[PDB]
């Protein structure tokens, strides 16, 4: 039996990161809280700035501890700006191809070809264009170049696959990302 393949997409090796910087009220970002011109696609020039500004990832802001006890003079409740993102450090990419019908030579299975090792595998996966949490293709890229660094452009996702939890002077990323390698060596 063989897979009757519809179109196919790319999945990256997504390792989830995040960062946050706290700026004071006296700073120039902060006024009576967070700028409304900060959005899930704004960046701070201040962050741990190695950041791939073209990549898939999410931002936000909140007031933090403000006081004479949290780094900013005059007891001002201060701003904390943060980005939670995914990254593909080892350039790994898998081509995923849903099987429309199994044909002689169960539902919602897909061929998962690794691209360096060319090792093949079978597993359930999302249909093209659905950043559905839980299954392979949470993150779907439209081109091998897009999956290589998870370009913001070619690639889709839910951003709730990654959680962040702020603390005082850093934050704590969480990942709900299903790993290809953890679905494709058991059924390889």
């Amino acid at each position, epitope marked *: 039996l063989k897979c009757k393949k519809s179109s196919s997409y790319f999945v990256p090796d997504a390792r989830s990161r995040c960062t946050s910087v706290r700026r004071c009220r006296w700073a120039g970002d902060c006024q009576s809280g967070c700028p409304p011109h900060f*959005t899930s696609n704004s960046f701070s020039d201040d962050w741990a700035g190695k950041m791939d500004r073209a990549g898939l990832g999410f931002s*936000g802001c909140s007031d933090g501890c*403000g006081g004479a006890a949290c780094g900013c003079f005059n007891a001002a409740p201060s701003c904390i700006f943060w980005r939670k993102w995914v990254e593909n450090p080892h350039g790994i990419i898998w081509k995923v191809s849903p099987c429309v019908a199994w044909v002689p030579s169960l539902t919602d299975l897909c061929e998962i070809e690794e691209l360096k090792s060319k090792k093949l595998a079978l597993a359930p996966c999302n249909q093209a264009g659905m950043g559905v949490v839980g299954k392979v293709g949470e993150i779907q890229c439209s081109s091998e170049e897009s999956a290589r660094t998870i370009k913001k452009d070619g690639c889709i996702w839910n951003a*709730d696959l990654v*959680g*962040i939890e702020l*603390r*005082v002077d850093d934050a704590v990323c969480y990942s709900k990302i299903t790993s290809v390698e953890a679905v494709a060596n058991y059924s390889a």
Partner: antibody, heavy 119, light 108 residues
Framework: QVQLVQSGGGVVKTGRSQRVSCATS????????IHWVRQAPGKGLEWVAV????????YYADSVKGRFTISRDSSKNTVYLQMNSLRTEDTAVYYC????????????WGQGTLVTVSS | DIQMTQSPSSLSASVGDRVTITCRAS??????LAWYQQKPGKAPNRLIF???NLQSGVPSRFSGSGSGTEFTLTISSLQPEDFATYYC?????????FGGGTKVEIKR
């Protein structure tokens, strides 16, 4: 500092409608999901629903699913819980609370808006 | 569906004591679990997230631990304000769910 201000409680006939609302400041509204947790009088806390950062994902407790709606207005920094075909047991203080992913724990709470549903 | 059961449903204890509430789930919930303090007719507060992380600003005498189906919240030294009802919440899957709660009353 982070704040969430409810309004819209009141009395309502068994079977009718109600809208509680939650208007937030302090943070960046369209980066956080919002949940509704309700408390009958002197009972435990009960989780009602949650809407994701963009409205795309809405999930509901099994007791109101099919009867309540959550929704959000980017411009007013507000989240709404609509309550249709209300029943007597639905009487509770409705608290709305912040959550960054739609699946994470809530951190900052609302002050509650009381809804009393009785014939 | 996942079910969070707290015990003891309520306990009576005194200032200086050590207090340990146990939240128990009917399925794995990993470390997606949180603890709340609710003084009466007030908004609950988050005490603990990630099952072990101290909500920023909650006193150091508070601590969480557990995984899977067992979680234990622990106040080393009950201070007079720590009397409240206490709730666990599992956010490992939708729908989320709270525990029953443990009321911590004064023992006399």
């Amino acid at each position: 500092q982070v704040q969430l201000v409810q309004s819209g409680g009141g009395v309502v006939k068994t079977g009718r409608s109600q809208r509680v609302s939650c208007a937030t400041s302090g943070f960046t509204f369209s980066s956080y999901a919002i949940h509704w947790v309700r408390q009958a009088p002197g009972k435990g806390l009960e989780w009602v629903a949650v809407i994701s950062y963009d409205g795309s994902n809405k999930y509901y407790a099994d007791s109101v699913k099919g009867r309540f709606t959550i929704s959000r207005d980017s411009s007013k920094n507000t989240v709404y819980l609509q309550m249709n075909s209300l029943r007597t047991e639905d009487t509770a203080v409705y608290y709305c609370a912040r959550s960054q992913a739609s699946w994470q724990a809530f951190d900052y709470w609302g002050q509650g808006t009381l809804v009393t549903v009785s014939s | 569906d996942i079910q969070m059961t707290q015990s003891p449903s309520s306990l009576s204890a005194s200032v200086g004591d050590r207090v340990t509430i146990t939240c128990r789930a009917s399925q794995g919930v990993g470390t997606d679990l949180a603890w709340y303090q609710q003084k009466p007719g007030k908004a609950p507060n988050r005490l603990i997230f990630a099952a072990s992380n101290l909500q920023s600003g909650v006193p150091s005498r508070f601590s969480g631990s557990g995984s899977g189906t067992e979680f234990t919240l622990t106040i080393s030294s009950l201070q007079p304000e720590d009397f409240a009802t206490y709730y666990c919440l599992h956010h490992n899957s939708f729908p989320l769910a709270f525990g029953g709660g443990t009321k911590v009353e004064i023992k006399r």
